[PDB]
Amino acid sequence: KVFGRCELAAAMKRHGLDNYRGYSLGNWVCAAKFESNFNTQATNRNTDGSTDYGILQINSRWWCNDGRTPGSRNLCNIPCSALLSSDITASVNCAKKIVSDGNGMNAWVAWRNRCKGTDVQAWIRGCRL
Numbered sequence: 001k002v003f004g005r006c007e008l009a010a011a012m013k014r015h016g017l018d019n020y021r022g023y024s025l026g027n028w029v030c031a032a033k034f035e036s037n038f039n040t041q042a043t044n045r046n047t048d049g050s051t052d053y054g055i056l057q058i059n060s061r062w063w064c065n066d067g068r069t070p071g072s073r074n075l076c077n078i079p080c081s082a083l084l085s086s087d088i089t090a091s092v093n094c095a096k097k098i099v100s101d102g103n104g105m106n107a108w109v110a111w112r113n114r115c116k117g118t119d120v121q122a123w124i125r126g127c128r129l
C-alpha cells in the first residue's frame with residue numbers, strides 16, 4: 001500500500017507513534033516518506049546483503065528475519081515480510097523497539113539526513129489527526 005501523507009500520519013498516531021520517545025508524529029511521517037515514499041512494499045538491499053523492508057525500511061540485519069541475511073538478528077521477532085503489510089502495525093511495533101534502543105530515530109538514515117533538524121511538523125500539516 002502507498003499511504004497518503006495524512007493517512008499515514010493518522011495511522012501512525014493511532015498506533016501510538018506521536019511523541020513516541022519524544023519524536024513528534026511529523027518525524028515518523030518524514031522518515032516514512034524518505035525511507036519508502038510511503039510505500040509499505042518498499043524493499044531495498046543494503047551493501048551488507050541485508051534488506052530494508054516496508055514503510056520504515058527496517059533492516060533485516062537487526063530487526064527482522066528474511067531468511068537470507070546470515071548472521072543477522074531478528075530483534076523485532078518478525079518475518080521481514082510482515083513489514084510489507086498494508087497494515088503498518090508490525091512496522092510500527094518494530095519501529096518502537098528500534099527507536100527505544102538508545103539511538104532514537106537516527107537508526108533511520110533517511111530521517112537523520114532528511115528529517116532531523118527540519119520542520120518535521122510540516123509533514124502533518126493539514127492532516128486531521
Ligand SMILES: CC(=O)N[C@@H]1[C@@H](O)[C@H](O[C@@H]2O[C@H](CO)[C@@H](O)[C@H](O)[C@H]2NC(C)=O)[C@@H](CO)O[C@@H]1O
Nearest residue numbers: 046048050052057058059061098107108109110
Ligand atoms: C531502522 C532501520 O532499519 N533503518 C535502515 C538502515 O538500517 C539502513 O541503513 C543500512 O543498514 C544496514 C544494516 O544495518 C547497514 O549495513 C548499512 O550500512 C546501512 N546503510 C547506511 C547508508 O547507513 C538504511 C539504508 O538506507 O535504511 C533504513 O534507514
Ligand SMILES: [Cl-]
Nearest residue numbers: 004005037038
Ligand atoms: Cl507524497
Ligand SMILES: [Cl-]
Nearest residue numbers: 024025026121
Ligand atoms: Cl510533528
Ligand SMILES: [Cl-]
Nearest residue numbers: 067068069070
Ligand atoms: Cl537470515
Ligand SMILES: [Cl-]
Nearest residue numbers: 011087088089
Ligand atoms: Cl495500519
Ligand SMILES: [Cl-]
Nearest residue numbers: 021103104105
Ligand atoms: Cl532520542
Ligand code: NA
Nearest residue numbers: 035052057110
Ligand atoms: Na533506508
Ligand code: NA
Nearest residue numbers: 060064072073
Ligand atoms: Na535478520
